Amino acid sequence: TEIEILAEKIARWARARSAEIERDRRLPDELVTRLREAGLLRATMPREVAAPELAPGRALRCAEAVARGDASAGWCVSIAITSALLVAYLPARSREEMFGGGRGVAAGVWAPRGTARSVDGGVVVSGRWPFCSGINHADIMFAGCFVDDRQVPSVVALNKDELQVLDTWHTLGLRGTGSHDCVADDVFVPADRVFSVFDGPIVDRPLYRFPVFGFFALSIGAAALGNARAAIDDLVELAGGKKTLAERSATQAAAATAESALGAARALFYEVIEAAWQVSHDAEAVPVTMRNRLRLAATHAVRTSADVVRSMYDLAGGTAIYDNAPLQRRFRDAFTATAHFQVNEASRELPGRVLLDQPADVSML
């Protein structure tokens, strides 16, 4: 069957529904079903819950291919396969309750915005989390919080049932991601469903040795990269018959600059994923040096993708300002992705610390 091939087929479906995806701020049910049937929304869950436990380079290649069809759809894949890693941090019994037998699609917001009081058998958590991508089609939301007075934050596995989904996702781009805010109000969480990411996974296999904050950052890079490739596709198709635009010296120098910039960002992206994947098979934890390279490459990929899409948009000139032009949505989507905290310009400083052998807190690298 081959999941990469299914990803490319689903990308073409996402492209054909892209007007409706943006209009409704959500993926159509038929597209969620395709994604679910191909295993893409649970690809990185462990084999014990009937899931592919797909290697991370393959999973990220799948996210990128769907993003080339539609950036919001690919982003949904990115967040679902990142969230799905946390299924490996649940004790066997709550894992089987929420995800057993092919069940459960996860969303996740890592920021520790909740406050959790400890009680008999569990905790009581309240808080509000912005930018919950995929909450429209997920069952479970992993959310970060502080438990009692601890200074190391925790994660609680909430059911969408007990949450209030507010209609707040009115944004420049990535509209289909429906990344609304979610509110918990005195929700009880059994102990079964509270953990620290910093204690490591219950399932101790290579996919879960792969750095989990690195993977999060890389999945945004994958969606950005797939969006940018689609923008170059759009410009090349326009330039042949616009009068021509293609026959003109600045256009080809710019097309050449963009193609080599994107190719170079893409090549570094997969080179560092493959190198970290190899050492994820070794006894010791993946070193800080390797984790540093994953974050460098993720940020570079998102920022280069934005530069590339901006250049294509600019070359299209008067065509791309109109709502019916494909480059306009790529532009809007690319400059929503650059705002994410895992891959913004500020995320260059800590990985620069490491490079310069300076004292650094690398707990979330």
Residue numbers in the entry: 6 to 248, 255 to 376
Sentences from the paper on this structure:
Our subsequent investigation of one gene cluster (Rv3093c-Rv3095) associated with ethionamide resistance that contained a putative monooxygenase/repressor pair with some resemblance to ethA/ethR, indicates that Rv3094c is likely a flavin-dependent monooxygenase that sulfoxygenates ethionamide, and Rv3095 is its transcriptional regulator. Ethionamide is a second-line anti-tubercular drug used to treat patients infected with multi-drug-resistant or extensively drug-resistant isolates, and is a pro-drug that requires metabolic activation before it can exert its cytotoxic effects. To investigate the mechanism of ethionamide sulfoxygenation by Rv3094c, we solved protein crystal structures of apo-Rv3094c, and Rv3094c in complex with FMN (Rv3094c-FMN) and ethionamide (Rv3094c-FMN-ETH), at resolutions of 1.91 Å, 2.00 Å, and 1.64 Å, respectively. All three crystals contained one tetramer per asymmetric unit, tetramers being formed by two homodimers, the C-terminal domain primarily mediating interactions between the two monomers.
The overall structure of the apo-Rv3094c monomer consists of an N-terminal domain (residues 7–95) composed of five α-helices, a middle domain (residues 96–214) composed of four α-helices and an eight-stranded β-barrel fold, and a C-terminal domain (residues 216–376), with a seven-helix bundle structure. The lack of a Rossmann fold suggests that Rv3049c can utilize either FAD or FMN, explaining the presence of FMN rather than FAD in the crystal structure obtained. A structure-based comparison between Rv3094c, one-component monooxygenases, two-component monooxygenases, and Baeyer-Villiger monooxygenases showed that Rv3094c clusters with two-component monooxygenases. Superposition of apo-Rv3094c structural homologs not only reveals strong structural conservation of overall topology, but confirms that the location of the FMN binding site, lying in the pocket between the β-sheet and the C-terminal domain, and stabilization of the flavin ring by hydrogen bonds are also conserved. Substrate binding, however, induces movements in the side chains of some amino acids in the apoenzyme and binary complex structures.
